[PDB]
Design a protein around this ligand. Sequence first.
Ligand code: CLA
Ligand code: CLA
Ligand code: CLA
Ligand SMILES: CC1=C(C#C/C(C)=C/C=C/C(C)=C/C=C/C=C(C)/C=C/C=C(C)/C=C/C2=C(C)CCCC2(C)C)C(C)(C)C[C@H](O)C1
Ligand SMILES: CC1=C(C#C/C(C)=C/C=C/C(C)=C/C=C/C=C(C)/C=C/C=C(C)/C=C/C2=C(C)CCCC2(C)C)C(C)(C)C[C@H](O)C1
Ligand SMILES: CC1=C(C/C=C(\C)CCC[C@H](C)CCC[C@H](C)CCCC(C)C)C(=O)c2ccccc2C1=O
Ligand code: SF4
Lengths: 741, 42, 78, 74, 168, 179
Amino acid sequence: KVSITVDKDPVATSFEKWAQPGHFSRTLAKGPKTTTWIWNLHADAHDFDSHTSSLEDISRKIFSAHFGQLSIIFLWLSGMYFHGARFSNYSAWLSNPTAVKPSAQVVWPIVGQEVLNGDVGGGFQGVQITSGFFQIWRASGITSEVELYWCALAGLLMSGLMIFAGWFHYHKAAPKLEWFQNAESMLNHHLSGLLGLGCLSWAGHQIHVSLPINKLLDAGVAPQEIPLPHEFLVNRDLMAQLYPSFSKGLVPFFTLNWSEYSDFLTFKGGLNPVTGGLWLSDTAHHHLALAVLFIVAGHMYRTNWGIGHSMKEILEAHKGPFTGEGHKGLYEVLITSWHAQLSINLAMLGSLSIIIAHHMYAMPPYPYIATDYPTQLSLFTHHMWIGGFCVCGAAAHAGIFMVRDYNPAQNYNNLLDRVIRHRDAIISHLNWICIFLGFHSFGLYIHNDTMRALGRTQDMFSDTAIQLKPVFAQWVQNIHTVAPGNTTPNALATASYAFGGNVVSVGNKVAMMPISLGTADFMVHHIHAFTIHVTVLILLKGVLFSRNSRLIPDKANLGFRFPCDGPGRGGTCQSSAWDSVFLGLFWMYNCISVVIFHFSWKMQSDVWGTVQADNTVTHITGGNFAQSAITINGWLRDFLWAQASQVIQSYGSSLSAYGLIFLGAHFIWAFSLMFLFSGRGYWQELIESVVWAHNKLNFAPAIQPRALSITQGRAVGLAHYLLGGIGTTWAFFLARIISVG
Amino acid sequence: MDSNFLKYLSTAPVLLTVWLSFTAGLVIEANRFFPDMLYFPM
Amino acid sequence: VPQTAAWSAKTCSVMVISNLLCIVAGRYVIQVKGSGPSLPLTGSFSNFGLPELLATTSLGHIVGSGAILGLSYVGLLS
Amino acid sequence: GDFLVHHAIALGLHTTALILVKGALDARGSKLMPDKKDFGYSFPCDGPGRGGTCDISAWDAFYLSMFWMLNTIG
Amino acid sequence: DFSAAVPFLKRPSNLDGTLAGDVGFDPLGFSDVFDLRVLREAELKHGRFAMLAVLGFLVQEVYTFPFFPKMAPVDAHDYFVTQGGGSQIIFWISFVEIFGVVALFELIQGKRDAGDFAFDPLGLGKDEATLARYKVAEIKHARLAMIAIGGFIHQFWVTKQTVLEQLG
Amino acid sequence: GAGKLQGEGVTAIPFAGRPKTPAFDGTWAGDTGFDPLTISAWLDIRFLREAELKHCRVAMLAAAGAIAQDAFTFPGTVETFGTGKMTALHDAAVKTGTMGQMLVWIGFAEIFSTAAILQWYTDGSTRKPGDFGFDPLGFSKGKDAARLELCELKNGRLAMIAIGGMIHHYLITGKGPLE
Ligand code: CLA
Ligand code: CLA
Ligand code: CLA
Ligand SMILES: CC1=C(C#C/C(C)=C/C=C/C(C)=C/C=C/C=C(C)/C=C/C=C(C)/C=C/C2=C(C)CCCC2(C)C)C(C)(C)C[C@H](O)C1
Ligand SMILES: CC1=C(C#C/C(C)=C/C=C/C(C)=C/C=C/C=C(C)/C=C/C=C(C)/C=C/C2=C(C)CCCC2(C)C)C(C)(C)C[C@H](O)C1
Ligand SMILES: CC1=C(C/C=C(\C)CCC[C@H](C)CCC[C@H](C)CCCC(C)C)C(=O)c2ccccc2C1=O
Ligand code: SF4
């Protein structure tokens, strides 16, 4: 029976434990005999599975932590909306979106930092923003700072509601483990209610608010002259002027005469010629269809009334001759381990973020976002990074589940057991494929470099030489170009003009044009494959060998996160599944850096640019990519050296902040190498000398100073490495694109 | 005020944050009212 | 744009037949029944409960909408 | 500019000397491994026993001083 | 149980009728999750502000100080915001509220009664019977004035007319 | 409250028989053994009777109002709203803002109705469904007490169908209830 059961007043709200750091952990509650205790406090703060053995307690803690996170996100959104309302040039941007740079942050004039308040436009000077909030609001139909103030108020109220809910559901009414372990009910409700009703409500908002307001805005009506959303709601005649099918009413809907709504529910495709974004009338139909699909999908599982499925039955029924027991035990694993669920959800969320980055650039969904090049580049790279981090976290939590919550007794001859039992084959084959891809993807660049440096330019892998044409990708692009009217008969235009078609230009600037793939694209795609495969190798090898290996037969006893097993066996450094995540995070950084560099160069060289009166488009770099992206020297010179000029010549301008952050990120990246190349013994001995110096003056801390643990040193090195590298790329990208766009 | 809440305010990170925010405010206001002081005036 | 015909005896007949077909198919296919009484019917329809009626009618409406729209698309219904 | 780069060079010389002198003087022993001379000059480590003993050798002091010497000469 | 005020609503558990003006009205159950003493202090602070605001509205409509420009009570707000008198009033209310914070902490600790600031300059509440009657009257008037001040301000916003002039 | 008119032993559909749900114990009023679809086996009888009595009251007060509006129109309305009847009058009053104020105050009342309904499950309230204590002029405090409950339910059931018929007749002919 799916039912609600809670414990009333399980934990008393009191500050007693606020003054007892480490209370959650038995080893830490004692006190800080050394400085390692300080770091352990933070390292184990949110490891609820190591505080108690009670799945009920862990689930309640996770629920309340989720409520706190939602409150934080609502506060973040309210802050962005309030800044748009109060410290922004949103009205000027609405008046002239193609001339004034969006800005919603202003700095104070203290030490000359007022230089950062650049001339963005519209009689306003501030910090140019690249988050796309202006376009989000324009699509939503916001045309005033009053509406943004109300949005901020709603965000603040929701943040308060979320924090209150977290406190209430931890200290006043904490649901029980039976409540938590309702996968069927939790998926039915999420799918139908959350997703389906969310997209249904958004479809209603788009149909009643966004569509007419944006129709008038594209027609050129002034934002002050456009009527108000409630006016549109209550004046069916006014809305019937813009979309003449509202005079029909809901009778077509309830009689299945849905063609009557073709005026505002249309499968049009392409991009809005005026705004350069997707048709909001297409988005409304998209979201309505998604709402129907999700509400139907949310009626698949059994809750209380007999109708539905049981995921246990489905999984146990799905088994074959190559897999023995098949998916038996997975339902129990997933309703008894939070870490398995976290791994799955993180992997899917990260892959979704990557997919979102791709689709949000080839099909700009918001008005005037396509020609806002800083926004496009920033969003693409941001979501790529979030996706990579989420994937690495999925690997980490898969390893944590394997070490902690994996039970061979309950996993016998099922898929998990069989994977463990032939892990050697998987890792060996992935190793071979990684080496093969590395060779045949990077040795090609090395070959081109050597031939160009030897003057044998006819022996290179180039479009003007030996060719490596991505015929399959070109074939797919041709399919998508010809689909409108042939394989998608009732679609007027292609899904994206990147596949092929005509250039979409807004404000004498390219919004989206066909992206041509050649030898350089073939090479860079195969390098992407190489990097992804190596990252997967590291993460999967760690996860599979988390529990045991030929080297360390008892590794689960050591744990998920341990430094080593000593200098024996030749040396067992970094053998755990945590160190696998550490190295795989390095490799994810490599992969995503190459991906975002590819995007930046390709889009600046073959998509983005200004269209002349001739109809010809001159790109930001002008075809550099085809003949330069085939050599590492070409990447070093025509991309890094060439495009770093904007960030290194930013001093004295509003991008001087970008220049300073460029330098600081370089500093942090280098500073990471001190932790990454070094070991604990040297620093402990140096601390011994420093402690002697302190003792010579008859004083020294009661908390004995200690060098960072080995794992903590690796973590600090990795964190500083990632911060420095990503910050360098951040400053470089933002400075370059804001200078040339 | 609750003694436990006061101890929580006395904890090391809270005190460090408050003290360094106070110091940053001191320096910021000094530079706001007496800016561009590259030297001790003599 | 496809054609969606206005409400008519044909549309009503398609919807009704879809609902009846899905009710019978639900009787044959629904494995687990809920715990409660049954609608006052005897014989094959002796364990027909409300929730099962409601489910069969929901699927029947999905199928009826799909069939109506598709038959209008191909021009048979319209 | 010469003044500033000269003090950078002073920092580099002093830090390389710090690493090398510490390695030389702690080569025979430290509070962590008070019997290092028994293990010699270039042993890998002493294990994760006393909180971790990575790079606890005079050879490792040399290995780090070589990064610092490459930084200073650069 | 059922609340005396609302026969069909159960009497809130925290509301036992001890406090003045307690008729068992708490449909949304704020008393269940929040301290009833803190809520009563908020109620009485609000009510005292509202009663003084109603009296101020009426007295400002009939009379204004010779040294201040004559204007409607609502417009006086925006005027004094720029003039600087509003800043002074806010500062002094904040000064008193600084000690109000200490009073609230003492109330939480259980040393004080919510809304009891020991303020009887004229000694009008010395005898108990009269004191309880006065407390009931105070809470009743507080709630009524909380409603009435909102009525006054909104009616002025609609009609752009002072209440005295509107009533005719 | 007779056991022949209502209560156990009464069957509206003989070929089916009285349902076995809690609603048909014979204690709940207005029981004619009528539940072909068996909705009372899946929803709380308390919730269902609350909804039924709310519908009864609203439809028993709307029908009387339609008759009153067609017979006597209050002075000052026949001019302000116009001369539209029934649902046209609803539109006119919406424009006037009358219906908006009505909605605001009815929502204020329905908030406390929501609290009363929730208290069945949250705090285990024992309120009777549809019982608000509104008995100012005493009739429930007497012999005709259960006979007045049955009359209320029966007249509300009559009025629901009556108002449906009246609204549809107005939609077709354009005439009010009195035609
Ligand atoms: C901490 C990480 C982080 C941060 C800082 C940001 C920051 C940003 N995101 Mg977000 N985003 C993140 C993670 C993050 N994202 C992840 C992990 C995803 C994948 C789910 C997304 C997906 C996403 C989308 C699809 C969009 C943004 C957008 C934005 C920008 C506007 C913020 C906003 O209010 O958008 C408000 C967001 C919207 C109006 C669009 C919402 C549409 C999605 C599909 C709703 C999904 C909701 C659902 C419950 C999620 C679970 C799905 C799962 C069950 C399958 C901003 C730069 C917007 C942007 O780029 O604007 C120019 C934008 O359209 N983000
Ligand atoms: C939904 C997201 C999610 C959730 C709920 C969790 C939950 C958890 N993770 Mg994590 N994890 C995630 C995503 C997530 N993870 C991702 C994306 C990754 C990949 C990087 C990881 C990788 C990972 C590892 C490798 C490990 C965990 C562990 C844990 C557990 C304890 C973490 C802890 O105590 O943190 C407390 C919080 C901190 C210690 C703060 C860390 C923040 C660092 C210092 C960087 C912050 C920089 C910040 C952005 C500012 C930069 C700007 C600069 C100028 C200041 C906990 C169950 C640990 C575990 O289970 O061990 C048994 C563990 O070892 N996770
Ligand atoms: C006799 C009754 C009847 C008739 C005549 C039709 C006729 C039609 N229906 Mg159908 N339909 C019916 C009953 C009927 N339907 C019923 C009962 C239902 C309810 C389930 C539906 C539900 C339904 C939907 C939901 C849709 C149709 C559509 C259509 C029309 C276009 C379909 C097409 O050619 O797609 C050909 C399309 C393809 C070959 C491409 C399919 C690929 C998609 C885009 C992605 C799927 C990939 C997947 C995720 C991965 C592959 C599997 C993997 C394991 C390998 C067609 C005229 C479509 C329509 O109206 O379009 C305008 C439409 O969207 N019908
Ligand atoms: C904006 C602004 C300003 C301002 C301001 C100020 C001071 C604004 C103040 C607004 C106030 C005080 C609003 C009060 C609203 C009260 C309501 C709706 C009570 C409803 C009670 C009900 C329904 C009771 C019902 C009752 C109940 C429950 C139980 C008993 C029975 C029943 C009768 C039913 C200025 C003036 C400074 C100007 C400046 O430019 C900025
Ligand atoms: C205000 C307004 C509007 C409006 C409106 C309104 C107020 C609309 C109201 C509509 C109503 C009240 C409809 C009622 C329909 C009742 C039916 C069909 C009963 C069937 C009973 C049966 C089949 C019984 C069967 C059986 C049973 C159970 C028991 C006994 C045996 C038997 C009888 C055989 C609009 C829409 C015009 C719009 C306007 O802008 C604003
Ligand atoms: C430098 C270094 C040290 C010495 C560094 C220590 C002990 C760090 C102590 C730093 C202080 C206590 C932090 C506070 C001051 C910082 C300037 C503030 C930033 C840090 C907070 C944000 C946490 C190690 O102990 C170590 C151990 C293992 C591998 C590599 C290394 C390593 O590289
Ligand atoms: S201690 Fe340092 S060096 Fe010795 S094994 Fe562990 S990690 Fe490798």
